[PDB]
Design a protein around this ligand. Structure first.
Ligand SMILES: OC[C@H]1O[C@@H](O)[C@H](O)[C@@H](O)[C@@H]1O
Ligand SMILES: OC[C@H]1O[C@@H](O)[C@H](O)[C@@H](O)[C@@H]1O
Ligand SMILES: OC[C@H]1O[C@@H](O)[C@H](O)[C@@H](O)[C@@H]1O
Ligand SMILES: OC[C@H]1O[C@@H](O)[C@H](O)[C@@H](O)[C@@H]1O
Lengths: 262, 262, 262, 262
């Protein structure tokens, strides 16, 4: 397989039962890693994810946890260490979103997205780094961001804020822990073919509309994001820290400006 | 009298009793605006500031409120509309910070900084914009960010995240409400001579350290940021929305690279 | 009379006879500065502009010069120091553009745009700064960039490259000369009502297209950019160096994402 | 070997006989690619580079060319096609630099760095894209940038400009040709252990000084950059376009801000 240094590395993935999280679990499974699949409520998908990793060539366990609960995040990293012996790669992937005019967005709804998307990533990143520091491991953090750490998003001001914060969070932790050989990076996916977008992409006018904002002309396959995660996690990215690697088919390049418009 | 168009405009300023908030309070006073001074903690400072605004040629009230409590933020905008008749410029200035190695940062300390710096600014922005939409006003929002929406800040991951989040929040709201003539901008201060820095700068070794990180060579004067706020709030900045205007004596330009090191 | 500190300052403006350069010429005229108007091609326009500056309350000369010729740029600064006694603000405004699919762009067409847009601004900046260093003056440089130092621009790769280059040039010179009190900033215009756009906008379908890409909804007025220049040149912007201040009605905020598409 | 899709891909590398260029030739040689090594004057190093590629498992030819001469760049891509059958990956790596106070930097010296670093990359990128377009190949461009497309660099204003322009050049070409499946990306190396820096890193105070601006605490090995190039060139980066992937050990994260300074 591709990245041989990933063999038997322990990888924790939050929201890892579906979409990008699942595709990442499978890919790390293809690299013969030991994957810890976090999930919120749907146990059966997690169990399904677990079997793919096994079938792909990897070891895997599943662990229930809500990333807005500190104890769950703490339990997740502890369970990983308990079961597999260590922790090598931490992937904070869980996220929620919903459209609301910003002047009508409730505090509770704002908080839910901030707590889940940003705070949960802080908690995950903290617990992993704590462990790498205490055990002198040159570990790796991957935080799942979005093109929306750069692209503003009307109706999604909570989401946009959460990823803008995630960017400075990541860049801070990378600077802080770079002297310990702990690397910290973001991935910035564009429009991806995942369960949350599977509704949106039903309407063929909606699918076309979204595709019109992707310069490469297609909605990303989750495996294309998982490829970026495996690269970033590997010793191939040894000198890469504090970055956001956008995998968006050009979406951050301002799709309205194609053909010399403007 | 510089920006005549600011005369009699209503300007609400969270944390307007000390530091940059006070400096801005005074400045809109010099432009003879109606300044609403929010304070949390210390009425005697707020009273002293209400005075300066009045001497400078302005009108002023003081309103107690915690920016992390929704009712306090809603009450603040409502109070401005009761006392002065309307709202023209919403300035979200309140912020806090404290150094903690990130792997040792507690969730509550993380939450306090996020709640204060980012969520309070969201609440402030939301309440102002709502007032602007429903009443057909081409209002203005200034969000007080930091060089640290761009410069990462070890020991201050919570603060950095809050300002990174404020950037995307500001940019989203600027895009979302631009077609309505509502402008939304950030100011990015560097190291300013304010109460938030008084302990740091009292230590002559630390003042010297901070100064060596400012290309222009001096710690900023709070009135140098207030000049930026007056400009942005004015119709001089009519085509200017969604920006962060750094007032940092060059700090974002990478102080370690002066004289061609690297 | 807004920025009183600008009274009697010497302001050199390349391409100051039309468009934004003219708008800026007039504006420093209103601040009663001494405006030196560089023009390349068309004395009758430059004469018409010299007039407006004089009517507005300013003093003005016109100086013929090609910004791609070093002797012309050196002569221009020298002429300003001969006619007016000194130099206070150097504004590098001259720029050109034309659409060509990039894979069909000729080296000479690439070179013309680079030479004009970036190298001319370097030469202008260099000559002004040299004058500032050797004579202990806390002078000011404004470089006229574009939303396209950030927004990529198919069919205009040469123009985009020139402005991306202008950004790093400006930022380097701001850092390099900050300890001397010399400030160096960019302005980033969006789509402005100028001669460079007259053909584009004459076509009502094209004017409508461009307008749909501006969040604020209108093509910018040249005086809205000149307001930004007056601010930056003033001592109001004393702590502001190394920035790009976009005046673009929100264009850099990603027009394709209005209303939550994506 | 790692990226099997790279087997027998034709890769052109400018300045590919030494430093990062050489390390990239070798790595692509390790992936059993066919490498075309451009070089300026030192034929013997090129010949050495050629043999490593062969010994690493790859096919290779060498070709003399000055990237400031259009005919040489045109000849380079033509020779690649002549000899190997096609072109798949174009890598514009050639670059020069030298320290000069900016107000003393000559036009000729400015031009040399602009012509080499930026214009040469445009020429290389153009010739490759022309070929991919005419032959419906989903080819790949990698432009060698620097941390200095983001980090300003006093005494190196020409270099900083050239890479700032390279960034917008790349991002433009990525947006323009994304609909054809042609990806265009930058790599942003920090301080790397290469012939040009081999002088600087002799002085142990200079080596230490440079290392003090690398958060990860070491000067990059050229192979760590070559790893990024192989990733970007591969179908693993299928959804990655228009990006700059910094490989700088954290240098862009503002090294002066370590330990909560500022
Ligand atoms: O680091 C520069 C400055 O950034 C500001 O946002 C902080 O409030 C200061 O405490 C700090 O000195
Ligand atoms: O400053 C970091 C590094 O940047 C690169 O672009 C330069 O070529 C190196 O010489 C330098 O050490
Ligand atoms: O695309 C927005 C605008 O950018 C400016 O820099 C160009 O000069 C205009 O022609 C263009 O309309
Ligand atoms: O807007 C592009 C994409 O950004 C992602 O962050 C969101 O989760 C997707 O739903 C969206 O389609």
């Amino acid at each position: 397989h591709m990245y041989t240094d990933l063999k038997d590395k322990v990888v924790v993935i939050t929201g890892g039962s579906t979409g990008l999280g699942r595709a990442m679990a499978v890919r790390f499974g293809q690299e013969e890693a030991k994957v810890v699949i976090n999930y919120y409520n749907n146990e059966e998908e997690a169990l399904d994810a677990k079997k793919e990793v096994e079938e792909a060539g990897g070891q895997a366990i599943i662990v229930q946890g809500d990333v807005t609960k500190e104890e769950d995040v703490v339990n997740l990293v502890q369970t990983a260490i308990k079961e597999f012996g260590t922790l090598d790669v931490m992937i904070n992937n869980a996220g929620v979103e919903n459209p609301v005019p910003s002047h009508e967005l409730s505090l509770d709804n704002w908080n839910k997205v901030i707590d889940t998307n940003l705070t949960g990533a802080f908690l995950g990143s903290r617990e992993a780094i704590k462990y790498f520091v205490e055990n002198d491991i040159k570990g790796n953090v991957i935080n799942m961001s979005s093109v929306h750490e750069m692209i503003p998003w009307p109706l999604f001001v909570h989401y946009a804020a959460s990823k803008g914060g995630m960017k400075l969070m990541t860049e801070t932790l990378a600077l802080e822990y770079a002297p310990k050989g702990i690397r910290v990076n973001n991935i910035g996916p564009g429009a991806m073919n995942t369960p949350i977008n599977a509704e949106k992409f039903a309407d063929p006018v909606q699918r076309a509309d979204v595709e019109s904002m992707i310069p490469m002309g297609y909605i990303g396959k989750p495996e294309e994001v998982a490829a970026v995660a495996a690269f970033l996690a590997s010793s191939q990215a040894s000198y890469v820290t504090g970055i956001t690697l956008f995998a968006d088919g050009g979406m951050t390049k301002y799709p309205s400006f194609q053909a010399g418009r403007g």
